[PDB]
Amino acid sequence: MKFETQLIHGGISEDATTGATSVPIYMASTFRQTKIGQNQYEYSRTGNPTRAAVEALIATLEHGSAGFAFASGSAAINTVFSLFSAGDHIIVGNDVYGGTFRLIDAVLKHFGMTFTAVDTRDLAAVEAAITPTTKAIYLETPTNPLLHITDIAAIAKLAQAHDLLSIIDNTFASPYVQKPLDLGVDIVLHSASAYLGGHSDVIGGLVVTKTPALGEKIGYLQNAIGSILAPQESWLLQRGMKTLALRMQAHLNNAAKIFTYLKSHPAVTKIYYPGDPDNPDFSIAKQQMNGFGAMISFELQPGMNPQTFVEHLQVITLAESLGALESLIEIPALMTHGAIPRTIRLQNGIKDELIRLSVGVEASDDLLADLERGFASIQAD
Amino acid sequence: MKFETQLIHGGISEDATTGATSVPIYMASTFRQTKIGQNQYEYSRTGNPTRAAVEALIATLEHGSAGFAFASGSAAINTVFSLFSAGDHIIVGNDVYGGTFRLIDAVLKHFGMTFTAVDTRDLAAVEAAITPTTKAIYLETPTNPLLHITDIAAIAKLAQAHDLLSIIDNTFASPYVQKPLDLGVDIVLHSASAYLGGHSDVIGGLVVTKTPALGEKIGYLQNAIGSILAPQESWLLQRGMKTLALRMQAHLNNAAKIFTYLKSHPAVTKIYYPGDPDNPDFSIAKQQMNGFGAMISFELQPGMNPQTFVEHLQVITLAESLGALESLIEIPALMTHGAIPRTIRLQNGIKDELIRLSVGVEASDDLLADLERGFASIQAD
Amino acid sequence: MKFETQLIHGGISEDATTGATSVPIYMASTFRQTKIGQNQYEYSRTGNPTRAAVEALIATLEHGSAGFAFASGSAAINTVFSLFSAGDHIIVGNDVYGGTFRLIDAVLKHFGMTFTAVDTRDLAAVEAAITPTTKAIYLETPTNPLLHITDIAAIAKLAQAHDLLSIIDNTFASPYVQKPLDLGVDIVLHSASAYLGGHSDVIGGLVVTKTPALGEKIGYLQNAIGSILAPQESWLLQRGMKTLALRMQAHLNNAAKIFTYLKSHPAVTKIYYPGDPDNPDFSIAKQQMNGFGAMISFELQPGMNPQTFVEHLQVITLAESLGALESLIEIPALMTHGAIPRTIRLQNGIKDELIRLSVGVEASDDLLADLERGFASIQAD
Amino acid sequence: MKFETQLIHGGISEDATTGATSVPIYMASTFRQTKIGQNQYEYSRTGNPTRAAVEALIATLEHGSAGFAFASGSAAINTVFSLFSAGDHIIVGNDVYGGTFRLIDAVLKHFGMTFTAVDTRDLAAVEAAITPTTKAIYLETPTNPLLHITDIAAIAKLAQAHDLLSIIDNTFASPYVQKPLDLGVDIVLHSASAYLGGHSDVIGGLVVTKTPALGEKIGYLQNAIGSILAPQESWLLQRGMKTLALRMQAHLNNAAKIFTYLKSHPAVTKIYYPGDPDNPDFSIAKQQMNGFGAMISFELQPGMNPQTFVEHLQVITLAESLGALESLIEIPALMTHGAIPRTIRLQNGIKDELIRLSVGVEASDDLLADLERGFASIQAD
Ligand SMILES: Cc1ncc(COP(=O)(O)O)c(/C=N/[C@@H](CO)C(=O)O)c1O
Ligand SMILES: Cc1ncc(COP(=O)(O)O)c(/C=N/[C@@H](CO)C(=O)O)c1O
Ligand SMILES: Cc1ncc(COP(=O)(O)O)c(/C=N/[C@@H](CO)C(=O)O)c1O
Ligand SMILES: Cc1ncc(COP(=O)(O)O)c(/C=N/[C@@H](CO)C(=O)O)c1O
């Protein structure tokens, strides 16, 4: 079936017993067994029909064999790194979500894991960073918040040639835009809190593995650590995923128009956007991404107050998060990336004045009218 | 106010703005800020009114400074142990939940943490286990499934004398029965999937710390690892907790009667129960526990089949989990503790014939009649 | 099985397919049919597993044939009265909930139904009100808010002798106190928003009938009018219902003490309470009720301001509704019964000075202490 | 703001106090009052923040003054008809949903209301039916299931000239397609179970009045009869509504392709579709509808078994209901319209073999392949 049909009917989308057109929400913590060990479900944390349903869906969408739903994107990441042990070495991208930087520095390094940050746009630099004790490569593409694009297929071949896990954080793209397991990657994960839920009303994470052997290891850690996605939220997450494609098209059309409009403003000095033809990422972006994503970051002229700008928007919402129906806007350095020290932020290209815009699905004319309220307030229209 | 009043009115139990006699379920993933950094709430994972309310309530019930709600009891444990680093040594009780055994051996030991199992009923053995790298003592009391009682106040003073964190799993008792923070312990935690929820319909974990400094450390890990309790399920947990005292009184009266009845039966060779006066635990049980719990384990004569016994009950339910309104029953070696290898199980007192019974709140007469069906099926009435 | 056991296991309390210890929440609106006319469920309004479970349970608890769940007690009453046609005449008790009065006067009378209000304590006056076009007798017992007791068995015999439907609103008592169908009544109904839900967090109605024929007519109207209880709230209602006996014991015990205490206060001139032995209803109360309920109304000395009294309570909550874990208090003339005109209020016994107290399950000591802050604020303790 | 922007941000879409980007779910049945009569909310049936939010939203979308949410479409209709009295006469269309027919015949006629069914496409017949006791005109447009289009503006002018209420069931269109209040109508109502919820997972109804005087009457009846939409489902409805415009566009695009495809199949003898240019309703549809709807009904050649056809579809689901993300199909005479007697069905144009297809948003190639499987099974490809 085609992708839009899989959103509506893929995974488990029905209750086989009743024919119900929605997967029932199994709040039950436990399950009566008639003879020990022959039940399909035993304990809600270990598995239950509602969570299994959204888990089957994301596996279908990402073209993986197994999916796993977690209480948050961060918990999904924490579980995946629980594959590694003291003395393992990991290669990480140098533009990541501030919370992933926090997990690495404040938790995983205490467990004896060691990390080297690399610009994964430079595959020479990636291969140079590989050591005999290296075990995996972890990167987001496009990145949070600079939207750097990494050649996934190239990273995956590099990874295969050295017996490394390749791990792609696919949050920003979504399986509608990018299916990294189709490019050789071992593990893909999402913060479902963004596009996959899409309604600004659910926190969760998703992991999909290509092979069943790696699925058995993730599933074992999922049950062992217990950072599971609750049944109500699993159900809400699936419901929102059903409109993923319809939402994404609106998202992407609106972003294309926002980019063009942002470039028509002299108040804007720099724009980060995978669809910029001047951007040297642009060719690998058009090859591996179905569209250019709905994130855009930009700087204003050095005299211009970003706080003043974002605080004078009226449709666009000043908030953390992204991928919601409503446009969200943020200053990474004061908000989602405050967890990264300022000196490190600035070495890796996150200026204190950078603005991150998650383009919603509102009417584009209303969005542009709103953005000009922001330019007007810094004398820049 | 008194405990029962606190269940209904404590923590946050009301919406201040409207007067709503229930805390609203905040499904929102994010919050509009009017200025950056002035919001009370910024991102659902970091905090939201709904999860905050149940966190406040368990903190009041346990007489602590701060509460923290997690996707499950296992996720609470995993977060607590992320306080520690590679090379840290931890003393654990030798009778723990099978999954806590699982997490320690399969995950925590890969992070460079080391562990020594000890009968925490023998305080000299505990002190003998303390090494220069030791960082904490972790134990359940009563234990799962043998219901061994440990002198909490003694363990705390031992831990304080050597700069250790004392961590008590209070799942089997609940704050109605046992308030470890009142006996000097540093951290108390729960699988909320038992008595606190009480209705067999929610998976969750709760952690309470005495001091605000330890609270800031748990809170930071909770946000950084992200195994939060979702909003809907936090609300459901708080709702169940409101009837904790009424449920607990009923649980406890049925368990008293179940204990008397199981001793009148010659088919039962051994009974594990804190209210047993033949138990050497009995004196400490009576001193630190308000009631003897509603868990009971027992063995049948070596001829008799426990699998047959449990499969012939019709009110008591054969399943995992405990602490629900419905009586639950289980064979640990085939179920909740099959994650511990057989050699270590029998070395530590868990025979394969052992039956664990979670005494519910049904009419006691309907419960004894049901147990008589199981005895009759192995010719032993 | 005994009542407490039925609460936990009666009606439908588990999912037969998986063994889930909770009935799953079927959010689906519709159900795939394989062959037309062969599905168990077709459309969620007509029926679904979640609502069916709570309907089955209340039917067990009330000793009836069929249960029906509505969006509120008002909607339940509206559907029951849709049994009747223009020209039909109904005898009603003269102390009914203000909203039942409003339905009758504002809606049902426009449908050509006619009504005589009668003190159903006086059976001779009930018989004198029976007319050639009379079809039914409808009353609450105990009444809202004067807690008048009517002889249920006698009213049924009277109704049977003239081919009338007898309808008892059982909200204040609950099946724990009073099972009207056991006394010959044709239809029993509840505002489940009170004791049955128990947690101040669900709006709902319930109807149970004795015979299947009357059940077919109520069910037909339920589906035709469509005032159904949604699945989420059906599941929440059933979960509340499981603790009904535990909660009721507590409610009843506190209300006993509250009554004793309110008689010791000279500021209280009059007390309405079915457990009052100076009450002429007391004997029939003791014969048809299992406990005297947990409502109490009372008046202060004419100088004393009831608004002052209730506004100075700190544990008792000033609000509408009743039957919650937490104590609620209210002034009917100003609140739940302001829908009745003041002249009709006074002729039927509801003074503007009247205070109605819904006794919760807080510790009785904290409740008596709270009540004396009320008395203190009008200089009367 | 534009329609697509109002979906995301109109009505009440935020929590004012916390800035939550989703309206909180107020499960509370009641609200503490500080001084009597000064609360914004007093009782959840009478109103609560969550239901108020979706009520504001639908009022904005339909360009009306006030919105009202009910437990189902049928309950919304039942409440609107409680505006009328015994002796009142109502004019109805002759093609209505089977349940509206049932409500009229089995309930409202018992209340002394009288009805005359009329082809509302024939304005002369409408005028001919107006009597001195007539008070309203009620019709769906498009109708269920023949999709008959009525000139709404003309019907409103007719009703204005005789001081009648015009009531339009707008379920099949959705406010994205059709806004009857902009054409002079007094009341618009929906079964929100269709396109508004959009996800096959909510039952509810909506009513919107143009004037505030009519709003006060509807609101008074809503509270008095109590057929409210519960808080959980109110919130789900609103979340579904947020994607209404994105879903509708996909709906309508698929329906145009399905219509073309069905017209090229000789097995199809008659098609009912508002966008058929040979349909005499085409011009009025083009003029008053923003698109032709996503419903299609059709008949096959007299030899061909419609049951065989629909039972061989694999993406299209045989089930009641409509307006869902997934395609639904149905045979009205055996299903949604079985409540109308067969003789009356055939008099008014519903043949026993009519098929009613609710076009979903699956990929159109997958839908066309699926329809082929149905035609193949009747030897008609
Ligand atoms: C690329 C990526 N991976 C993982 C996560 C973490 O996932 P949860 O938020 O725990 O669900 C995030 C979160 N980022 C949001 C929230 O701060 C934001 O930047 O605004 C992310 O952007
Ligand atoms: C003393 C203790 N601590 C932690 C946990 C782990 O808590 P979650 O299940 O993750 O909520 C449990 C679980 N025990 C149940 C579950 O199988 C059981 O044994 O039947 C426990 O008993
Ligand atoms: C004896 C009785 N029957 C029916 C109803 C109507 O029940 P819903 O509220 O529609 O569920 C009520 C409600 N009374 C509450 C609420 O005002 C109260 O008096 O405080 C009632 O007390
Ligand atoms: C034009 C119209 N108005 C009102 C209703 C009644 O609305 P609820 O179902 O009570 O929400 C319906 C329902 N019809 C659906 C379900 O049978 C169907 O035909 O498949 C309707 O189609």
Numbering used by the authors:
A (entry chain D), B (entry chain C), C (entry chain B), D (entry chain A): 1 to 381
The authors write:
In eukaryotes, the reverse transsulfuration pathway, which is composed of cystathionine β-synthase (CBS; EC 4.2.1.22) and cystathionine γ-lyase (CGL; EC 4.4.1.1), is involved in the biosynthesis of l-cysteine using l-serine and the sulfur atom in l-methionine. In the present study, we characterize the detailed enzymatic properties and determine the crystal structure of the putative CGL enzyme from L. plantarum SN35N to provide the structural basis for the reaction specificities. In summary, the L. plantarum CGL showed γ-lyase activity toward cystathionine and l-homocysteine to generate l-cysteine and H2S, respectively. In addition, it demonstrated β-lyase activity toward l-cystine, cystathionine, and l-cysteine to generate l-cysteine persulfide, l-homocysteine, and H2S, respectively.
Similarly, l-serine was also found as part of the external aldimine formed with PLP. The α-carboxylate of the l-serine makes a strong interaction with the CGL enzyme, like that in cystathionine. In addition, the side-chain hydroxyl group may form a hydrogen bond with the side chain of Y97A (the distance is 3.1 ± 0.1 Å), although the electron density of the group is weak. In the crystal structure of the L. plantarum CGL complexed with l-serine as an analog of l-cysteine, the dihedral angle formed among carboxyl carbon, Cα, Cβ, and Oγ atoms in the PLP-bound l-serine is − 36° ± 17°, which seemed to be suitable for the β-lyase reaction. The conformation is likely caused by the hydrogen-bonding interaction between the Oγ atom and the hydroxyl group in the Y97A residue (3.1 ± 0.1 Å). The l-cysteine molecule is expected to be bound in a manner similar to l-serine, where the bound l-cysteine molecules undergo the β-lyase reaction to generate H2S.
